[PDB]
């Protein structure tokens, strides 16, 4: 059915793309077998503060399977200027810088 928040690290496939619509589309590869789980992703201003400032366009990002190597597509509306796309937390948290002109 469905579990908590994904506990394993993710991996970015390619590089976030500009949709020319003010949003970015990125593909992630999940490495865990604990799904179905919710993807911990967010658009924050600085790494010094993980308070979500941007907004997810994709509805409640999820890994729908309990098999590894699952890939998920996400569209976000990061704030203007600098921000980071952060996935995961703790020791398995990863981020990707971004700047919206």
């Amino acid at each position, epitope marked *: 059915t469905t579990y908590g928040v994904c506990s394993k690290a993710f991996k970015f496939l390619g590089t976030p793309a500009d949709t020319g619509h003010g949003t970015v589309v990125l593909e992630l590869q999940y490495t865990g*077998t604990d799904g179905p789980c919710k993807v911990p992703i967010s658009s924050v201003a600085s790494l010094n503060d993980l308070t979500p400032v941007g907004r997810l366009v994709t509805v409640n990002p999820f890994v729908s399977v309990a098999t590894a190597n699952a890939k998920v597509l996400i569209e976000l509306e990061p704030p203007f200027g600098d921000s980071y796309i952060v996935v995961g937390r703790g020791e398995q948290q990863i981020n990707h810088h971004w700047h919206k002109s």
Partner: antibody, heavy 119, light 108 residues
């Protein structure tokens, strides 16, 4: 330095119940899954189950003829495994392993604690 | 559950040669396979994760490769310190399963 110190080997009466401990140090205890792997002397490796120390979520190899229970004491950063109704079948070296951030593979193993079920 | 079957358990090779212990999974484990090395009276040691990712503290003479259902652990220029038991493990889904292991032996 990530390291796992397990409890010492032990001889238990069949039917009895035992608790193997696994003290984690050198890393954020709660952000990982501790795996429990079994290996009977002449056999290979078999997955007993794991536990997400940070949330307490457990996953057991349901099909194993053994009653296992995982608990994580985030206060002492120690993962335990309770094994009840012991059998000569459960006699084996039990390993404590840490599940890597990048998948259900273990990157750090304890030196294993040997459990012998015998009268 | 997913069954992991490795190539013949008692394989031989000569120091310096190249060997390959194979691992077959009863189904596509989507590249999610790891290899461990276990020396007499020692805890298993992680060698490869995700078919080809070489763990640190692991000499590059150890390379893994694989996908779908077949995975190979190649040891280029085998050494005497490589004598050990080698297991593959799929990390595609629970329950996690290991191969019976392959014992590397040398011809001299």
């Amino acid at each position: 330095q990530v390291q796992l110190q397990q409890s010492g080997s032990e001889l238990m009466k069949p039917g009895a119940s035992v608790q193997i401990s696994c003290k984690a140090t050198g890393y954020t205890f709660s952000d990982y899954w501790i795996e429990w792997v079994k290996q009977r002397p002449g056999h290979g490796l078999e997955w007993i189950g794991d536990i997400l120390c940070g949330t307490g979520r457990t996953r057991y190899n349901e099909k194993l003829k053994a009653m296992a229970t995982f608990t994580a004491d985030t206060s002492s950063n120690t993962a335990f495994m309770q094994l009840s109704s012991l059998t000569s079948e459960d006699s084996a070296v039990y390993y404590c392993a840490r599940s890597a951030s990048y998948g259900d593979y273990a990157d750090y193993w304890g030196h294993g604690t040997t459990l012998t079920v015998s009268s | 559950d997913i069954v992991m079957t490795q190539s013949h358990k008692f394989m031989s090779t000569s120091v310096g040669d190249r060997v390959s212990i194979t691992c077959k999974a009863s189904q596509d484990v989507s590249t999610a396979v790891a290899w461990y090395q276990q020396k007499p009276g020692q805890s298993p040691k992680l060698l490869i994760s995700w078919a080809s990712t070489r763990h640190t503290g692991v000499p590059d003479r150890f390379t893994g490769s694989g996908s779908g259902t077949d995975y190979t652990l190649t040891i280029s220029s085998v050494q005497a310190e490589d004598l050990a038991l080698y297991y593959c493990q799929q990390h595609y889904t629970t329950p996690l399963t290991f191969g019976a292991g392959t014992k590397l032996e040398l011809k001299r």
